[PDB]
Paper text:
Ribosome inactivating proteins (RIPs) are enzymes that can inactivate ribosomes. Some are type II RIPs consisting of two types of polypeptide subunits, A chain of homologous and functionally similar to type I RIPs and B chain with a galactose-specific lectin domain that binds to cell surfaces, such as ricin abrin and abrus agglutinin (AAG). Abrins are potent toxic heterodimeric glycoproteins with an LD50 of 20 μg/kg body weight; while AAG is a relatively less toxic heterotetrameric glycoprotein of which the LD50 is 5 mg/kg body weight.
Two NAGs are found in B-chain, but only one presents in D chain. An AAG molecule is a hetero-tetramer contains two subunits, ABA'B' (or CDC'D'), stabilized by mainly hydrophilic and little hydrophobic forces. The active site is exactly the cleft formed by the intersection of all 3 domains in AAG A (or C)-chain. Five invariant residues (Tyr73, Tyr112, Glu163, Arg166 and Trp197) and five conserved residues (Asn71, Arg123, Gln159, Glu194 and Asn195) are located in the active site cleft. Docking study revealed that due to Pro199, agglutinin is unable to form a critical hydrogen bond with G4323 of 28SRNA, which is found in the docking result of abrin-a. This may explain the lower toxicity of agglutinin than abrin-a, despite of similarity in secondary structure and the activity cleft of two RIPs.
Residue numbers in the entry:
A (entry chain B): 5 to 267
B (entry chain A): 1 to 250
Write the structure that this text describes.
Amino acid sequence: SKICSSHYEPTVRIGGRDGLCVDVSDNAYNNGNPIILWKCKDQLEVNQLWTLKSDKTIRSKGKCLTTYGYAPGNYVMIYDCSSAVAEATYWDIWDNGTIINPKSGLVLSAESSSMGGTLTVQKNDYRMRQGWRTGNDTSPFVTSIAGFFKLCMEAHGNSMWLDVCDITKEEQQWAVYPDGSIRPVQNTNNCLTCEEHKQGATIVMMGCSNAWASQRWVFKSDGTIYNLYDDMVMDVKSSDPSLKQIILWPYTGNANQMWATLF
Amino acid sequence: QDPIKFTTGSATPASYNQFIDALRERLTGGLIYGIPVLRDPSTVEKPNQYVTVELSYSDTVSIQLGIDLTNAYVVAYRAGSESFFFRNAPASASTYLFTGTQQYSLPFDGNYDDLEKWAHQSRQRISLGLEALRQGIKFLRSGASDDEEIARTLIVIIQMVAEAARFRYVSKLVVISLSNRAAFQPDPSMLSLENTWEPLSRAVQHTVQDTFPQNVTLINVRQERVVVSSLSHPSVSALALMLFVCNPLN
Ligand SMILES: *[C@@H]1O[C@H](CO)[C@@H](O)[C@H](O)[C@H]1NC(C)=O
Ligand SMILES: *[C@H]1O[C@H](CO)[C@@H](O)[C@H](O)[C@H]1NC(C)=O
């Protein structure tokens, strides 16, 4: 009832693109060994566990998550926290799912769509491939997504629209990946994405292998599904369910913009 | 101006939501990480620790609930010139609530273990919906001195008003119910949220580097363990109102 204590330094996994985990290459801890994205293993291994140190370092087995440099494309590696340049070891994990390096202003990124890829720092574009979620439990969050009036988001091939909520329908089960993508349980290769980065674009299905800023979303405290890059939210076209169309639109706060994760 | 009220006789997905938002707005002490938070207990004087809410069945039948502004808990209800406080209620509740009515004590506390115990039925088996709510108000407004039934009806009301205000998930479930014109029982995820309100509140407020200091475990429809550790985890959006724990800064 006074002030929260922040001396707690938790150790957790960091999931991202396609539900993979931030892994320390072949459990090799030699200064410079690159950091990559690997299958989150069944066991909670040290090379995939990180400690959110109070000085803003993210350590694994005593070494520091570090960027080779401050330029777009520079990869990130494991490195002795004392031997390294201090600025290259600091990271801010924002509430948006962005891991940013203060000194460079660049953000943790997974540019390769293939497991094993090395992580790098890049200009921040709030793309699916730059979205992360701390936590040992790195699995996608499966759940229903309820819009207004007894209506739930349903997958229809490569299209998505509303239908009366029915827990028996698999087409209404969604998988929200640690990278911010909302995927249809029946085909995790599909991802809800806007067609265009403009007001009015409809949300459709597209191959997640792209990992665009249009395939990343945050379930905001105001009940909306929000897109960082576009600064807009999922909205039921002119509050008319029959139009079988969910589009991008600026925040109004109306019922047709309210959603709820019904897991 | 006037106390928050819910006219069930003309309830709609819209009127119900308007009702809940007004209650949340009234209970909001501030905001932490964009999430509304109940007022800090060591900040409110006892004369301002309670608020009333009215639930009407018709233009001549309604009851009022007494709610502690500090924890969003229902501490009592009023029916006619009588009022009933949970056995668990502190001296201040009857001192500032229901003044003017004959006040009485209930033989059970306002927690779910006791309520379930006296209702001979757990939450998971008690139906929720518009027809249950209205049945309950009419039952409480009368005087049928049946504790088993009073506890059961109070379990209905607490979740449709109190939990509904705390969770965007609950109010959402109540709305599909109205739209569906079909009763429903809480699934294991609804109970998970009810049973985890306090630690979730503690988690959020202790957040550092977008991470909770200690994980918070939630249970879903399939009864699977969903272990949350991030302030930006989608499940956190189910929280509409937090219990106050600490102000972040240091
Ligand atoms: C994650 O797992 C590690 C190793 O099992 C454990 O030490 C750590 O505390 C866990 N993170 C939590 C529970 O916050
Ligand atoms: C998230 O990152 C910071 C702090 O959380 C904030 O300035 C930024 O605006 C956020 N991202 C958005 C909303 O684009």
